[PDB]
Tab-separated table of C-alpha atoms in Angstrom:
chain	number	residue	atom	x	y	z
A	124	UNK	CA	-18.181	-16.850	-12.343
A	125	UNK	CA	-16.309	-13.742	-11.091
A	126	UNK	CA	-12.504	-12.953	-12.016
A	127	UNK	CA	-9.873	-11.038	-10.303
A	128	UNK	CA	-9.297	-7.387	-11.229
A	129	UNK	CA	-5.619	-6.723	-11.914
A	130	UNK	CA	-5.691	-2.924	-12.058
A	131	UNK	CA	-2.658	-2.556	-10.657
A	132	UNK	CA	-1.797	1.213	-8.712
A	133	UNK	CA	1.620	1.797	-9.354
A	134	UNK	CA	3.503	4.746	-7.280
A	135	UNK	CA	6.717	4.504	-5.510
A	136	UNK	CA	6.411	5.079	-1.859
A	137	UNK	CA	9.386	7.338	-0.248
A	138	UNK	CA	10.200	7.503	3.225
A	139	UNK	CA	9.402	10.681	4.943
A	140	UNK	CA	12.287	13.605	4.038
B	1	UNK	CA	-5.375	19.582	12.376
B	2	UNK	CA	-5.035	15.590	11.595
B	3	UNK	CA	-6.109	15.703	8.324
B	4	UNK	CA	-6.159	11.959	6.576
B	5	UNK	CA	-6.878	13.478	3.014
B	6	UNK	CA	-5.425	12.906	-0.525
B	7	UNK	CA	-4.640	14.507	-3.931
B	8	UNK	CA	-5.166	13.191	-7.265
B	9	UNK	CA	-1.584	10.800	-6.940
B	10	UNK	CA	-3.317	7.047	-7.206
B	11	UNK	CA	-6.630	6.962	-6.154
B	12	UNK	CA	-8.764	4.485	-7.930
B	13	UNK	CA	-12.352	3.915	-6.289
B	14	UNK	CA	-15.508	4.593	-5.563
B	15	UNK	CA	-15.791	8.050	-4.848
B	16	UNK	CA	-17.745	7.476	-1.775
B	17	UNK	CA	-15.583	4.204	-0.584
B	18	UNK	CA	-12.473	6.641	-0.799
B	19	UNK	CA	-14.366	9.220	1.053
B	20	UNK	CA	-15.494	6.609	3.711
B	21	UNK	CA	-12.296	5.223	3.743
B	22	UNK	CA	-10.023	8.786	4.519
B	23	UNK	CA	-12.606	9.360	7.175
B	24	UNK	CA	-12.440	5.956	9.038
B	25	UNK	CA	-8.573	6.293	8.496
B	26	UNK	CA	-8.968	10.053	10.520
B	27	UNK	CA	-11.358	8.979	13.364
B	28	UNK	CA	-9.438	5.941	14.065
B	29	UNK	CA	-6.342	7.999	14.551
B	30	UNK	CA	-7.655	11.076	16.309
B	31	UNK	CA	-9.761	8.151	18.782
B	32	UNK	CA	-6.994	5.872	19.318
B	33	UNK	CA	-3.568	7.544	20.452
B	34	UNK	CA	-1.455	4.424	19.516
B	35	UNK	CA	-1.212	3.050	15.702
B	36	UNK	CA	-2.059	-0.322	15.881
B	37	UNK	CA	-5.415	0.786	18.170
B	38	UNK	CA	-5.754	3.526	15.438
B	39	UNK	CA	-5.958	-0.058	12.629
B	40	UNK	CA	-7.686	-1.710	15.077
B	41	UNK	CA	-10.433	1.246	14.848
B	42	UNK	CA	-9.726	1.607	11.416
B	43	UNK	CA	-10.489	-2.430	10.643
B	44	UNK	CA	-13.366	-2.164	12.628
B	45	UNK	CA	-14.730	0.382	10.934
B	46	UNK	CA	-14.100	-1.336	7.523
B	47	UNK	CA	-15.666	-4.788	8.604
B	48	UNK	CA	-18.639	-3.081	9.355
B	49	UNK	CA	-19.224	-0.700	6.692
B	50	UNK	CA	-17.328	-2.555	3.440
B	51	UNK	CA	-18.037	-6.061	5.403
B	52	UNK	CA	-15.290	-7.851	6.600
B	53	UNK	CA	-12.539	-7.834	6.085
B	54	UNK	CA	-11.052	-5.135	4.743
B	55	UNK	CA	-7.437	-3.528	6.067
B	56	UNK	CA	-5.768	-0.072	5.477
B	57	UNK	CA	-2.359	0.022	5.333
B	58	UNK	CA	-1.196	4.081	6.464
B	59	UNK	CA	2.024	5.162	7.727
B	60	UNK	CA	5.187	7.118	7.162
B	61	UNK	CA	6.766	4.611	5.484
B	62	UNK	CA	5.597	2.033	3.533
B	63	UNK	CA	4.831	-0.012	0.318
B	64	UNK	CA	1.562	-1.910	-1.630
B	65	UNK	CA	1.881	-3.920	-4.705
B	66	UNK	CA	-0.892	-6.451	-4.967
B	67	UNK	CA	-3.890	-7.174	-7.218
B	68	UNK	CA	-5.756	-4.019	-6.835
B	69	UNK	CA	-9.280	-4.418	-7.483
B	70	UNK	CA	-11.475	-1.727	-9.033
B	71	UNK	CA	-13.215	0.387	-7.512
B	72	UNK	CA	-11.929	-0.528	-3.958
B	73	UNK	CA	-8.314	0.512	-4.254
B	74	UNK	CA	-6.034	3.493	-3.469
B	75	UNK	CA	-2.321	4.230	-3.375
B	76	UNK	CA	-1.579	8.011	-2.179
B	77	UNK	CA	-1.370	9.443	1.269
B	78	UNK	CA	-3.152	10.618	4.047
B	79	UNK	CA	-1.596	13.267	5.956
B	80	UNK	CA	1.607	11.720	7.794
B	81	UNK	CA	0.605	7.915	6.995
B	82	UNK	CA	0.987	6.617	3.205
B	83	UNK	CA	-2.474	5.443	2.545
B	84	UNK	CA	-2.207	2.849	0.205
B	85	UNK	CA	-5.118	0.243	0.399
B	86	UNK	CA	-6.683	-1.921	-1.818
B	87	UNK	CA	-9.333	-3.988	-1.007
B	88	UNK	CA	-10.322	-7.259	-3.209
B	89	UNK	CA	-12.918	-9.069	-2.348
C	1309	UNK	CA	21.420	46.422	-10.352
C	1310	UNK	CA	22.442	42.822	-9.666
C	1311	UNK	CA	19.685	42.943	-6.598
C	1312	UNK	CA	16.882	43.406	-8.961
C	1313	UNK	CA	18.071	41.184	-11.881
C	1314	UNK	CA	19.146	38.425	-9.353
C	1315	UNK	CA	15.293	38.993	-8.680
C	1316	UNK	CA	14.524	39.172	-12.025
C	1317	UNK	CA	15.792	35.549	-12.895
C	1318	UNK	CA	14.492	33.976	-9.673
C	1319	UNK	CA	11.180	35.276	-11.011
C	1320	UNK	CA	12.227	34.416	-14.438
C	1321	UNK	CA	13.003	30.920	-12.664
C	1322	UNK	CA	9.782	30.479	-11.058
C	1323	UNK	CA	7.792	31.288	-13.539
C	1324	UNK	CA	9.134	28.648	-15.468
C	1325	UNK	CA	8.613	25.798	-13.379
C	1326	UNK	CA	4.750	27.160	-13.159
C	1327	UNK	CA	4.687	26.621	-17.061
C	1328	UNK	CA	6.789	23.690	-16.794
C	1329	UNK	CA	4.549	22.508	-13.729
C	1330	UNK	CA	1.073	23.061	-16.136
C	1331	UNK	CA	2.717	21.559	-19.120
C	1332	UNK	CA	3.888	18.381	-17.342
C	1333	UNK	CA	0.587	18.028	-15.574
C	1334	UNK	CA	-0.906	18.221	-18.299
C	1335	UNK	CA	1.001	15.582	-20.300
C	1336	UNK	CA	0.482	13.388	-16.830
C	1337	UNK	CA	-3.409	14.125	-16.927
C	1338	UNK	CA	-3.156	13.071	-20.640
C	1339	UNK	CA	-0.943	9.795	-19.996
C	1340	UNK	CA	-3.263	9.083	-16.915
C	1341	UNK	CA	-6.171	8.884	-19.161
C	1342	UNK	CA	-4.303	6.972	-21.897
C	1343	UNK	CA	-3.208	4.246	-19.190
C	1344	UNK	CA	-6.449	4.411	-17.383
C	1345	UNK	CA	-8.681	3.917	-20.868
C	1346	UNK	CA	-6.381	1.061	-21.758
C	1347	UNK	CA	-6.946	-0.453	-18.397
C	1348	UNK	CA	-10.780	0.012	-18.379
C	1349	UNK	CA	-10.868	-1.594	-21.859
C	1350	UNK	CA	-8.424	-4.361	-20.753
C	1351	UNK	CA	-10.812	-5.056	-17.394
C	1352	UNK	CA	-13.882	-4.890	-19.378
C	1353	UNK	CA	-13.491	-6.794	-22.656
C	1354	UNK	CA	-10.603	-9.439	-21.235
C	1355	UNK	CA	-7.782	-9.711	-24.052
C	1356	UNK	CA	-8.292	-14.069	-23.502
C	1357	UNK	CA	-12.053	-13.765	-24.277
D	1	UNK	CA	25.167	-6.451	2.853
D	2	UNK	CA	21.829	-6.035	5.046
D	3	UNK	CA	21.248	-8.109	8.128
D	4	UNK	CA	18.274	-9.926	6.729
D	5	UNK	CA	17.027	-11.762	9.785
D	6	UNK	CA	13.775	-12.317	9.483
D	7	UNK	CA	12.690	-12.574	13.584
D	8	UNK	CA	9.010	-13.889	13.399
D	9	UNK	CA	7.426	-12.296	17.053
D	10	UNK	CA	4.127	-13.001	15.950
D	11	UNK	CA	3.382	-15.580	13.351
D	12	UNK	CA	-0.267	-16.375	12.499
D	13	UNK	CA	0.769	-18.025	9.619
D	14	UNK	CA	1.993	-21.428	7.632
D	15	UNK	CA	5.607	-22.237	9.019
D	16	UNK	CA	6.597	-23.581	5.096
D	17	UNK	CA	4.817	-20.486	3.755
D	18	UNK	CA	6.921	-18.111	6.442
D	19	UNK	CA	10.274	-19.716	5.579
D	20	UNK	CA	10.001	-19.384	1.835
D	21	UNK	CA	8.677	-15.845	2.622
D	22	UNK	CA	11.668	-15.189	4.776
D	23	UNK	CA	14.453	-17.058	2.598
D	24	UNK	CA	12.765	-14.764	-0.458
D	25	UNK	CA	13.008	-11.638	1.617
D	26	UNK	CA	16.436	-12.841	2.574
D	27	UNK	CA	17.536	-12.930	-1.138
D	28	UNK	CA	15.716	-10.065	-2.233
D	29	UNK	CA	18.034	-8.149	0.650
D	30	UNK	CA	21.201	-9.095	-0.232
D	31	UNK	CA	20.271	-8.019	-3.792
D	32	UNK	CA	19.123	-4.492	-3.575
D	33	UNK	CA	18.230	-2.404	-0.112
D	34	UNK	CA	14.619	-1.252	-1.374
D	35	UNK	CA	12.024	-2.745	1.184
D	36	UNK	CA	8.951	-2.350	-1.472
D	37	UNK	CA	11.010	-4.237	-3.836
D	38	UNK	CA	11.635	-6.645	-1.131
D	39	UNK	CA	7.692	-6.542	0.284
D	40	UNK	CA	6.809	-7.003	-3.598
D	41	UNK	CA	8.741	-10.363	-3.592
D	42	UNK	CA	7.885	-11.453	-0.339
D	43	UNK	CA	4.147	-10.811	-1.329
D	44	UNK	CA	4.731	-12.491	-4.748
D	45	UNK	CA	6.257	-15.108	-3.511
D	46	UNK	CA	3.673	-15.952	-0.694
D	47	UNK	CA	0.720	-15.644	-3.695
D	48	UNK	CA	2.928	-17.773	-5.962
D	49	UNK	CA	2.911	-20.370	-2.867
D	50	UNK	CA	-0.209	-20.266	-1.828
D	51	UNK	CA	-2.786	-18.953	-4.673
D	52	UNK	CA	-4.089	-15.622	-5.071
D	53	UNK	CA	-3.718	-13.183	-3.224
D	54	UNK	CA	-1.416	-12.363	-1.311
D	55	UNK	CA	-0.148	-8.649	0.297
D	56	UNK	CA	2.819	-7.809	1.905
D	57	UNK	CA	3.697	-4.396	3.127
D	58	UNK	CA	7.360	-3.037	4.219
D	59	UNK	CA	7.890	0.138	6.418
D	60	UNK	CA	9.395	1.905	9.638
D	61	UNK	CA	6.948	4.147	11.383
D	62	UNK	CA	3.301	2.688	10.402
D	63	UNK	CA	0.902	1.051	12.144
D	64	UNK	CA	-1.638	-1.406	10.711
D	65	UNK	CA	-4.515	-3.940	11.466
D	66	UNK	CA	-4.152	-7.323	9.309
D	67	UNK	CA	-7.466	-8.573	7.517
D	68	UNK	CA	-6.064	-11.812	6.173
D	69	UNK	CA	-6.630	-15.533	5.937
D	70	UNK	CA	-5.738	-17.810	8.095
D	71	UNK	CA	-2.137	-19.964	8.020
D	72	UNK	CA	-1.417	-16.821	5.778
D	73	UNK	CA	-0.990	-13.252	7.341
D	74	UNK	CA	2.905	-14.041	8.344
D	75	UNK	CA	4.450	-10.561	9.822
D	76	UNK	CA	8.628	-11.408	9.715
D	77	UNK	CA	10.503	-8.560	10.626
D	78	UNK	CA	14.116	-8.605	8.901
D	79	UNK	CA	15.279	-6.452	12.354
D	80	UNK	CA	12.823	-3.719	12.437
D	81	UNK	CA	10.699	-3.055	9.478
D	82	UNK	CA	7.853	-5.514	9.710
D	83	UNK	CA	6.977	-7.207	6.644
D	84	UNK	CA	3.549	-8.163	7.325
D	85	UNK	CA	2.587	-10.277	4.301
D	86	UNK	CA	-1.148	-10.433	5.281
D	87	UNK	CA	-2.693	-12.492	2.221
D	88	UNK	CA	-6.284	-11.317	2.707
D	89	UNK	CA	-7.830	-14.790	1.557
């Protein structure tokens, strides 16, 4: 069988400023 | 110029899927003058050329935390629109 | 006088958040690898094997 | 607090799946104002519910297309930001 990847990309998202 | 580009922020895939990816992003958005025709374009695009169905999320604001597969995934953005898509399976 | 130090310490400034910029980014490059080798390893050999 | 109404325009999804979605989102509201955090949840939540995976995506100005399964992609809006909690399969 296949698994599921969790590689995970983690970066906060801020509004626009 | 409308460019749908990206720095080295979060970008993890395929060098030419990211590529692809940016560029479908930027042709949707320079064809279609509204977003969702711009996603509409933009899905299209994916179904056809990653199979379906793949989705992009991109806008000013927004926010992606999901399984991220490898090779298939990105998190940055892409000019005005946060590109953050990650496609799995 | 104070023109050109006032000068002087905004270049002073600067050019220590360029050092501070290439030190950081390079201790972000270096933690980027670190996280991205532990994740490769993780994906390929799966800790539950 | 935050008016956490979660007004479902369009909902191509599971009404049980929506509500727990929406009563999650509701929760995740009163306890802190940060719409990823409350997009995380509401995407947790809907995978917890209903198997991997699931996406959901919280902004203001954005615009995209939904590649989801069906009785899954629910897109509640808690007043305006859209949380679109497309579970692509």
């Amino acid at each position: 069988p296949r698994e599921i990847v969790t590689y995970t990309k983690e970066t906060q998202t801020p509004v626009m400023a | 110029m409308c460019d749908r580009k990206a720095v080295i922020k979060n970008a993890d895939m395929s060098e030419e899927m990211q590529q692809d990816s940016v560029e479908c992003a930027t042709q949707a958005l320079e064809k279609y003058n509204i977003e969702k025709d711009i996603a509409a374009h933009i899905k299209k695009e994916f179904d056809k050329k990653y199979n379906p169905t793949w989705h992009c999320i991109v806008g000013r604001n927004f926010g992606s935390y999901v399984t991220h597969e490898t090779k298939h995934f990105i998190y940055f953005y892409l000019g005005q629109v946060a590109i953050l898509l990650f496609k799995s399976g | 006088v104070q023109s050109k130090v006032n000068l002087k310490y905004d270049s002073w400034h600067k050019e220590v958040l360029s050092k501070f910029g290439q030190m950081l980014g390079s201790n972000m490059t270096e933690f980027h690898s670190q996280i991205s080798k532990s994740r490769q390893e993780l994906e390929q050999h799966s800790v539950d094997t």
